[PDB]
Design an enzyme around this catalytic site. Sequence first.
Site, mmCIF file in Angstrom:
data_model
loop_
_atom_site.group_PDB
_atom_site.id
_atom_site.type_symbol
_atom_site.label_atom_id
_atom_site.label_comp_id
_atom_site.label_asym_id
_atom_site.label_seq_id
_atom_site.Cartn_x
_atom_site.Cartn_y
_atom_site.Cartn_z
ATOM 1 N N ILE A 36 0.928 -0.919 -0.253
ATOM 2 C CA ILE A 36 0.030 -0.376 -0.162
ATOM 3 C C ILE A 36 0.580 1.562 0.531
ATOM 4 O O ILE A 36 1.812 1.525 1.024
ATOM 5 C CB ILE A 36 -0.943 -0.022 1.399
ATOM 6 C CG1 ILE A 36 -1.933 -1.183 0.898
ATOM 7 C CG2 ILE A 36 -1.700 1.532 1.733
ATOM 8 C CD1 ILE A 36 -2.482 -1.008 1.642
ATOM 9 N N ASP A 37 0.907 2.238 -1.435
ATOM 10 C CA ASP A 37 1.899 3.964 -1.303
ATOM 11 C C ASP A 37 0.868 4.823 -0.828
ATOM 12 O O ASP A 37 -0.300 4.048 0.473
ATOM 13 C CB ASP A 37 1.501 3.696 -2.469
ATOM 14 C CG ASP A 37 0.789 3.699 -3.230
ATOM 15 O OD1 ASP A 37 -0.569 3.160 -2.913
ATOM 16 O OD2 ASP A 37 0.332 4.832 -4.093
ATOM 17 N N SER A 38 1.505 5.444 -0.940
ATOM 18 C CA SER A 38 1.019 6.613 0.380
ATOM 19 C C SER A 38 -0.161 7.229 0.006
ATOM 20 O O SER A 38 -1.100 7.478 0.751
ATOM 21 C CB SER A 38 1.993 8.143 0.203
ATOM 22 N N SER B 23 -2.754 5.241 -1.357
ATOM 23 C CA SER B 23 -3.499 4.639 -0.982
ATOM 24 C C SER B 23 -3.838 4.515 0.114
ATOM 25 O O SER B 23 -5.164 3.936 0.744
ATOM 26 C CB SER B 23 -2.938 2.563 -0.885
ATOM 27 O OG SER B 23 -2.449 2.845 -2.616
ATOM 28 N N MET B 24 -2.873 4.298 1.508
ATOM 29 C CA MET B 24 -3.307 4.606 2.965
ATOM 30 C C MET B 24 -3.666 5.620 3.401
ATOM 31 O O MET B 24 -4.659 5.965 4.280
ATOM 32 C CB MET B 24 -1.958 4.868 3.279
ATOM 33 C CG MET B 24 -1.879 4.265 4.682
ATOM 34 S SD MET B 24 -0.178 4.227 5.255
ATOM 35 C CE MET B 24 1.244 3.770 4.216
#
Lengths: 82, 82, 39
Positions: A37-39, A41-42
């Site tokens: 999970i990238d920034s 998506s988070m």
Amino acid sequence: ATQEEIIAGLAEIIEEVTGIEPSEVTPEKSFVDDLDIDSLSMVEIAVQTEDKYGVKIPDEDLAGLRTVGDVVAYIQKLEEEN
Amino acid sequence: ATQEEIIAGLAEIIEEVTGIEPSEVTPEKSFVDDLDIDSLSMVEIAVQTEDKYGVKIPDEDLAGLRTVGDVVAYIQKLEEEN
Amino acid sequence: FDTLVVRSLMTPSIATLLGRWFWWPQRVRERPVPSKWPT
């Protein structure tokens, strides 16, 4: 709420954001590494929690958070700080 | 009067100004938050209450009041202050 | 241009900014009633 209740709600949100099974998500799992999970998506996980549970996490805090246990403890910290 | 009697009177008025079911009307509900009632609609409840039971709720208290139980307490307070 | 920019970026951005006033005159909420955590 309870740590178990916190996990149940958050795990469901991750499935909406990414598709990872709620049972698959464990406190050991890490958003960046295990969940991939990238920034961006988070943020969606925090956003959905903001509308559903009222917990909003900005960019700076989300970058610091690494794993599910960290996020659950971070939210449970707010619940502890009632 | 009794706590239920105050709620029963208030519940009927809510069904008139806003059309919200009496089952939704519980003491812990909040007009602004839980009941989604704006300031003006809350005033109309006081106007009907004044012309029906004599209980006059000024605008200063209406802004202060947050939940149904808070309103009931003030009405019970006005029952005390009779 | 409309599908990729206006429909995808411009239109959703405005809705978030206006909040409940985007759906004016219909009175709506920014968020629903704060829900408790499920068991």
